[PDB]
Enzyme design. Sequence first.
Site, PDB file in Angstrom:
ATOM      1  N   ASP A   7     -28.458  62.484 -30.351  1.00  0.00           N
ATOM      2  CA  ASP A   7     -28.254  63.805 -30.942  1.00  0.00           C
ATOM      3  C   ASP A   7     -28.574  63.823 -32.439  1.00  0.00           C
ATOM      4  OD1 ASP A   7     -27.136  65.925 -29.111  1.00  0.00           O
ATOM      5  OD2 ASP A   7     -25.806  64.236 -28.612  1.00  0.00           O
TER       6      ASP A   7
ATOM      7  N   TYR B  84     -35.164  68.490 -17.374  1.00  0.00           N
ATOM      8  CA  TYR B  84     -35.052  68.773 -18.801  1.00  0.00           C
ATOM      9  C   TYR B  84     -36.331  68.359 -19.534  1.00  0.00           C
ATOM     10  CZ  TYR B  84     -32.378  69.372 -23.251  1.00  0.00           C
ATOM     11  OH  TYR B  84     -31.837  69.779 -24.434  1.00  0.00           O
TER      12      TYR B  84
ATOM     13  N   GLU C 262     -25.043  74.487 -20.812  1.00  0.00           N
ATOM     14  CA  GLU C 262     -25.009  73.052 -21.021  1.00  0.00           C
ATOM     15  C   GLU C 262     -23.888  72.747 -22.020  1.00  0.00           C
ATOM     16  OE1 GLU C 262     -27.993  70.893 -23.145  1.00  0.00           O
ATOM     17  OE2 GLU C 262     -28.290  69.395 -21.498  1.00  0.00           O
TER      18      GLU C 262
END
Lengths: 395, 256
Positions: free
Chosen positions: B60, B175, B49
């Site tokens: 993030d 995911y 990834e």
Amino acid sequence: TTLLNPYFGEFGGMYVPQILMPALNQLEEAFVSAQKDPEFQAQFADLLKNYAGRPTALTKCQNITAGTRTTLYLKREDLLHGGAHKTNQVLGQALLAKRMGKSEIIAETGAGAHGVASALASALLGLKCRIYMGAKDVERQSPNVFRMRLMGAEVIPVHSGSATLKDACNEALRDWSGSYETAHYMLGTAAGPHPYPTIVREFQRMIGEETKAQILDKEGRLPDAVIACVGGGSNAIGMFADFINDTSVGLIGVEPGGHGIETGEHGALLKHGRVGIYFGMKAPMMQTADGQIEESYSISAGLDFPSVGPQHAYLNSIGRADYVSITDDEALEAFKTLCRHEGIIPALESSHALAHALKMMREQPEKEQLLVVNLSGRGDKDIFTVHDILKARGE
Amino acid sequence: MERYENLFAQLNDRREGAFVPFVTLGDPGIEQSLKIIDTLIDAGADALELGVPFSDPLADGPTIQNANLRAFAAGVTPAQCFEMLALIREKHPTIPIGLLMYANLVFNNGIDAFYARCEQVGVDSVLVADVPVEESAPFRQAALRHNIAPIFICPPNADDDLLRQVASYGRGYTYLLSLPLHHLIEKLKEYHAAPALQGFGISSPEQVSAAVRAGAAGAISGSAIVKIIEKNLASPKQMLAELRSFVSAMKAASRA
Ligand SMILES: *Cc1c(COP(=O)(O)O)cnc(C)c1O
Ligand SMILES: [Cl-]
Ligand SMILES: [Cl-]
Ligand SMILES: [Cl-]
Ligand SMILES: [Cl-]
Ligand SMILES: [Cl-]
Ligand SMILES: [Cl-]
Ligand SMILES: [Cl-]
Ligand SMILES: [Cs+]
Ligand SMILES: [Cs+]
């Protein structure tokens, strides 16, 4: 699935990580519910009136238009508690937080105005408030940082990315994605993911509602145009909303031209910023050719936002509202003009709206026109900025 | 291509989970990022990834924020990332390569053109961090037209409606970010979702084995690799050594 349309035409949406969708859906449901609840409306009205001071004055400015056929009124949001229009919607969003059982507030701020508005609303309604603010802003906005701390908010400097508003915006969302069960994210403009452009408009719309009743009372008809400055878009959409269906009434939004459109140093994104996806929405952005988000610029800190609310992009695209820009120098002139001729010190943000109205008048002084400028805030905070320019320029 | 489908069929035959490290492309610069990635593969990464530096990575945490800052300090651009991706595919024909993107970088020069460029350089999947399934239609459509798997996050706060949409719309892998873990994993299988990789807090071998034991196809280390980069900025030599050691341990933990 949502209860309301998240889009204004092609603009808007909910471009947030999956983890935040239940937070937005929860918020939307609580808003829809609140809007139908007389008890919520009565509480909001009581705070607006008895705490913030609504209704605000509509002042006829005779000296500044003398010897023209322009009649100019100012909607005096500068007289609201906190001295800017931001107070109206932070009170509504505080009440929504309480409606949802939240006892904490998160807010972003750049200039500091929204951080102070969030902190005062939080102190009044007993919410614990934390404010994200880019390290560079913290350093630049001592007075507002201190006001926030006096009101008991926690001020958290953000050191990531460019250390400015967009970076504080990111950090507020990071926090909320983990804390939304107990904390409400009190977004500071009519932008962001749905439902925030809708909520913020509806919690600002008393500005235009009042303006309409006050101009009917004083003049016996609607304005030819209402004019408001545009950062993210809240004070302008608040002035505009109740006039949208009055098709004879012009809606003019004034973005910051900074050092001039051609210098690239500005915040006029409706004509000059390419549509992007960021801050949770599809809207014009200040951005590099390869799609990195960049800083806007304005003499006025409050207008320095590198995007624009999606309902403004929509109103422009259909030609219901017109958008223009005013440069730093123009706004400075309008600031001086109102101080000297009407004894009102306007926020440099609001001075952009006034500057455009003055140009409307001066360019065509025998045109009959009834204008309202939304004076979104007071300019006590700008006197040192204005001082330093004048001394430097040899005035 | 069918790189994920092929990978998963091979791992299954070996009763092994996938181990998938994340790095930011161009962190701490192009040459070192290329060596980092080759080290990850040599040490046993089953897929990659790869993040493209973006100004405002609002999904993030600090470690990745700082990696973006390091790549910008080095002048890394999306174009240079796409050059790197073509080189990586050319060195390594079968390893699935997935990007983690932000919506602006995909929409910037046209959604279709973005995915066409992904196809040209040989990327297999794209996860757009700030596009929820409710907004995903134009991204999924462009992805599939260009033989790219659209990847969706299944969050802790998932519900059944979301499980059904993620099952329906995702391809390649699902995911997972950790209704217990075993329920989510079971329901995803029941709805014929793409194989689940566990992406929450994968920083040690025990978490890799835990993920596989719970019935996920494998695990994604979202930030531990980047942390090793951060830790070793001043010695690229040792950086590579520590990267190899960590990935090898992590991959070992996935084995039957
Ligand atoms: C915050 C602020 C603005 C700009 O923000 P909007 O959301 O566009 O209204 C303008 N004027 C004043 C006085 C402000 O405080
Ligand atoms: Cl101070
Ligand atoms: Cl929470
Ligand atoms: Cl009357
Ligand atoms: Cl320009
Ligand atoms: Cl443009
Ligand atoms: Cl390098
Ligand atoms: Cl491919
Ligand atoms: Cs006049
Ligand atoms: Cs703007």
